[PDB]
Design a protein around this nucleic acid. Structure first.
Ligand code: MG
Ligand code: MG
Ligand code: MG
Ligand code: MG
Ligand code: MG
Ligand code: MG
Ligand code: MG
Ligand code: MG
Ligand code: MG
Ligand code: MG
Ligand code: MG
Ligand code: MG
Ligand code: MG
Ligand code: MG
Ligand code: MG
Ligand code: MG
Ligand code: MG
Ligand code: MG
Lengths: 88, 119, 101, 73
RNA sequence: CUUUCU
RNA sequence: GUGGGAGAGGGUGGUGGAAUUCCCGGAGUAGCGGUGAAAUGCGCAGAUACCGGGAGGAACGCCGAUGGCGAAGGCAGCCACCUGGUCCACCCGUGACGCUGAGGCGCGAAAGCGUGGGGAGCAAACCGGAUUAGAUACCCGGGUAGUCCACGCCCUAAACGAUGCGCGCUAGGUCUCUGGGUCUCCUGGGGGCCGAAGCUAACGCGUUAAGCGCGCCGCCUGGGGAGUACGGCCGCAAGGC
């Protein structure tokens, strides 16, 4: 489970500025947390499909955001990735 | 034969035949009877009458052993059931109690087709 | 980490030595799994609603504790080993839900 | 026809989640260890729901029965 | 029990 | 985002009691069983009925709903862990980042298939007993695959609301599940019933539209021949598209 703190350390880590919780980087940031967390859970439980449908969604919701970013501030984009590890 | 006075009267009622078994205070059978035990050979072993005869048979046979008081234990949901319960009462034996203990699965084995289709 | 209610029912025929014997254990078991121990209640001998292990009674235990989620199952695994330990039931601790009040 | 009291009416405040309070939990069982219907436990969809799971907990601990023998008849 | 056809 | 909420949503581990079967001990005797009635069958190598002990497989009474969860298929004993969705309040953050979706990929009841394991109960096939004009059936006694687990495959269905997805607009009443509030009521999400306008061949539908509109996909074009043939793709096969 992602602890509140766990999450917080992440948001602050990305917020484009103090209080920035809903920015596209924070989001792509947060989502990426859940995804990697979900993937680990799925390596074990290869048969837990309902969860995996949940995964498929997060991933889509991500690339969609990322896409928006690359379509606006390609730098932020090119940066958001390198900082994370997406497209790896 | 071995004086037991009080004991248990197990009635095993059903759609195909009733059968009673008088036991000693702790489960061991003193004597038993059934619809077959008596005359009736097939279709009517179930009839409530037969149930009466059997119960009555079971009593006598058991009173001879010194019986004269029983806690009845009803099992199965067939005809003649409630009838034998009355029988044992009209018999010598004193019916000190009555208890339906028909077993029922908290859902275990797939019943025969004859009993399925229900849910 | 997280609160739990470790319920334990053990053989109702122990001499004061055999009793404290299994308790000294239940304890260690707990300590072996970083399980801290908050308030406890010991009702001991009680009349079960059904024969447990052929025996018509049981000595009850109840430990409210705070332990690591990653090891609540093992805590149980371990606990169960004892022959005098008849039942172990750990439970995540929920607030009360008073009714008719 | 169910026209008497409810295991709730005839009683006061209690912790529906308390699986050890055998005293009051019993009240919610039939003449047999069967869990009473909300129809007569007076509870509510939600409360009746929690009871069901609490009673089931007590049963495993052996505080409450799974089934009882019907007397009389 | 089953219990066809016109 | 923050704070809250309900749930048989999913995966793994463990665990409880009822019942059936078998085994062991006790007690006990002549039948039990099954049916419209019977017979096959089981029982003196002692069955049936009864008490005690054990083993094992499968399923989880009451709660239970007229209920809840999931995209669907589906999902209910209890405990822990792991994980998906979702709703409400606060208006706090980004700033149209949206909708739909050919193809692709994934999931997908039952039966079925492969390898291994398991097998209590039930039961295609089958072995018999009845019924009958016959009875390759319905009824009765047996019974194998299978049903259960793992891993791999198959991918169908009355896979049904026989109703694609999203958004906006158009009387209310009543019952209910779940949240919020100033809580004999207001408001939000879900499930039902009745109904305004309107729609419909009719039946019916009616803020959970089958009404009034926009966007995108899919599909239909008389019946039989036929979901057949051929071809192609998929599959170990059955067979699927
Ligand atoms: Mg704002
Ligand atoms: Mg701005
Ligand atoms: Mg597009
Ligand atoms: Mg399938
Ligand atoms: Mg299958
Ligand atoms: Mg197979
Ligand atoms: Mg059979
Ligand atoms: Mg035949
Ligand atoms: Mg048959
Ligand atoms: Mg309404
Ligand atoms: Mg309220
Ligand atoms: Mg509504
Ligand atoms: Mg409503
Ligand atoms: Mg009209
Ligand atoms: Mg008309
Ligand atoms: Mg209507
Ligand atoms: Mg044609
Ligand atoms: Mg080929």
């Amino acid at each position: 489970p992602i602890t509140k703190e766990e999450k917080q350390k992440v948001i602050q880590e990305f917020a484009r500025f103090p209080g920035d919780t809903g920015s596209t980087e924070v989001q792509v940031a947060l989502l990426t947390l859940r995804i990697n967390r979900l993937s680990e859970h799925l390596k074990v439980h290869k048969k837990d499909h309902h969860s995996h449908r949940g995964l498929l969604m997060m991933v889509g919701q991500r690339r969609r955001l990322l896409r928006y970013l690359q379509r606006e501030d390609p730098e932020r984009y090119r940066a958001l990735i390198e900082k994370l590890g997406i497209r790896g | 034969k071995r004086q037991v006075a009080s004991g248990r009267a197990y009635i095993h009622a059903s759609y195909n035949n009733t059968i009673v078994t008088i036991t000693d205070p702790d489960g061991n059978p003193i004597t038993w009877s059934s619809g077959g035990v008596i005359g009736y050979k097939g279709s009517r072993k179930g009839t409530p009458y037969a149930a009466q005869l059997a119960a009555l048979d079971a009593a006598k046979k058991a009173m001879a052993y010194g019986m004269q008081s029983v806690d009845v234990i009803v099992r199965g949901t067939g005809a003649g059931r409630e009838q034998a319960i009355r029988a044992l009462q009209a018999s010598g034996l004193q019916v000190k109690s009555i208890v339906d203990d028909t077993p029922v699965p908290h859902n275990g084995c797939r019943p025969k087709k004859k009993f399925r289709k229900a849910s | 980490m997280r609160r739990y209610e470790v319920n334990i029912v053990l053989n109702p025929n122990l001499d004061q030595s055999q009793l404290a014997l299994e308790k000294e254990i239940i304890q260690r078991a707990l300590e072996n799994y970083g399980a801290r121990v908050e308030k406890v209640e010991e009702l001991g001998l009680r009349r079960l609603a059904y024969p447990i292990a052929k025996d018509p009674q049981g000595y009850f235990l109840w430990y409210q504790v705070e332990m690591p989620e990653d090891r609540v199952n093992d805590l149980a695994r371990e606990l169960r080993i004892r022959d005098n330990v008849r039942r172990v039931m750990v439970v995540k601790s929920q607030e009360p839900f008073l009714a008719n009040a | 026809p169910s026209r008497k009291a409810k295991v709730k009416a005839t009683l006061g405040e209690f912790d529906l989640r308390d699986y050890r309070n055998v005293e009051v939990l019993k009240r919610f069982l039939s003449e047999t260890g069967k869990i009473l219907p909300r129809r007569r436990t007076g509870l509510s969809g939600k409360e009746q729901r929690i009871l069901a799971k609490t009673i089931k907990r007590a049963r495993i601990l052996g505080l409450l029965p799974f089934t009882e023998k019907l007397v009389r008849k």
